[PDB]
Design a protein around this ligand. Structure first.
Ligand SMILES: Nc1ncnc2c1ncn2[C@@H]1O[C@H](CSCC[C@H](N)C(=O)O)[C@@H](O)[C@H]1O
Length: 327
DNA sequence: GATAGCGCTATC
DNA sequence: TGATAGCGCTATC
């Protein structure tokens, strides 16, 4: 994550819905904003969250009275995505875990925050002929909010991860925000191998499988993209080996495969999966952030989390627009 | 809960 | 296409 000297969100209050690890909090907090409420129902996520913010998020958002949520200026929410991801069954809103956005929709109805910040996977952008994104857009307009939506890839914001996500920035129409803009991409100068841990710390992660089949020669030069080198088994999810010289693939929350949730990488001749801490770095989390004691949960948490840095550049720009109030 | 084979999708 | 990749799914122990 990046250091932000000029705090654009000082004095502003924000809610952390579907908090997970607190990625949205890490980001807005770096911009000066203050967290007044967090929500997350996963026992384990609540555990890590506390382990890092000394607070315990509140359970099932679908049973919390909106009127109960603290007043706030910015609603952050990277709601569930299993129901919209390229990787899953795409049952969209029909999916039990897919209606959560309407839970946000009604929080906003009550609290009427100055800004609604949301995040989800790229496929949500076009899911079901783009009708999903459209309901969200109209549902937001009908609450009296503008709807700024764009798909950014982490690799375009200082983080070596091919994580493409759709970010939705909604401003209350009353405030007349017109100069909002999404961060401009900038050259990726960091790669997977720059974030790796020393071999001695990742030995236990090394995987040696007879079905290891290297299909591509390691790359000498760093690149702003994922470069597959080899594969194990049938090369399915979590069975693909990539170049540390390139960028990492998308961390997943439920992903399987021998390299479950992180993907395989080639480090000093050995083939291995990433370490939870490496995921953290891959997600833009500061090493000072405490990962969950359970590697599996830790991986899941980082898997469906967000890249802080990206969240920062957006958050900072959110403040700019918010603060630009000439006479 | 943790591990891991998968199998079908979107994209150009 | 043909090749690549995905905050996933779910069976098993
Ligand atoms: N009804 C509900 N109430 C609270 N949290 C819920 C929920 N349904 C799903 N979730 C939570 O939704 C989160 C979606 S992933 C969001 C991750 C988060 N922005 C981060 O940076 O970690 C998960 O942590 C999941 O456990």
């Amino acid at each position: 994550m990046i250091e932000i000297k000029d705090k654009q969100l000082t004095g502003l209050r924000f809610i952390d819905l579907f908090a997970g690890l607190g990625g949205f909090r890490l980001a807005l907090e770096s911009c000066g904003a203050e967290c007044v409420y967090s929500n997350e129902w996963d026992k384990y996520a609540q555990e890590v969250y506390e382990m890092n913010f000394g607070e315990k998020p509140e359970g099932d958002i679908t049973q919390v009275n909106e009127k109960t949520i603290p007043d706030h200026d910015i609603l952050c929410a990277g709601f569930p995505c299993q129901a919209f991801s390229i990787s899953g069954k795409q049952k969209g809103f029909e999916d039990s875990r897919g209606t959560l956005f309407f839970d946000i929709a009604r929080i906003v109805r009550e609290k009427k925050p100055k800004v609604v910040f949301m995040e989800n996977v790229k496929n949500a952008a076009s899911h079901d002929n783009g009708n999903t994104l459209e309901v969200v857009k109209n549902t937001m307009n009908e609450l009296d909010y503008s709807f700024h939506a764009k798909v950014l890839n982490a690799l375009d914001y200082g983080i070596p991860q091919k994580r493409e996500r759709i970010y939705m920035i909604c401003f209350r129409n009353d405030l007349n925000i017109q100069n909002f803009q999404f961060p401009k991409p900038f050259e990726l100068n960091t790669f997977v191998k720059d974030l790796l841990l020393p071999d001695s710390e990742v030995e236990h992660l090394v995987i040696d499988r007879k079905d290891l089949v290297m299909t591509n020669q390691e790359i000498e030069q760093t690149t702003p993209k994922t470069v597959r080198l080899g594969i194990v088994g049938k090369g399915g999810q979590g069975e693909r080996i990539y170049s540390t010289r390139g960028i990492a693939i998308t961390l997943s929350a439920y992903g399987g495969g021998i390299f479950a949730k992180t993907g395989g990488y080639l480090v000093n001749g050995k083939t291995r999966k990433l370490h939870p801490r490496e995921c953290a770095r891959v997600m833009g989390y500061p090493d000072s952030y405490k990962v969950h004691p359970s590697t599996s949960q830790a991986y899941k948490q980082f898997g469906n989390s967000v890249v802080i840095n990206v969240l920062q550049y957006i958050a900072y720009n959110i403040g700019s627009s918010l603060n630009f109030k000439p006479y």
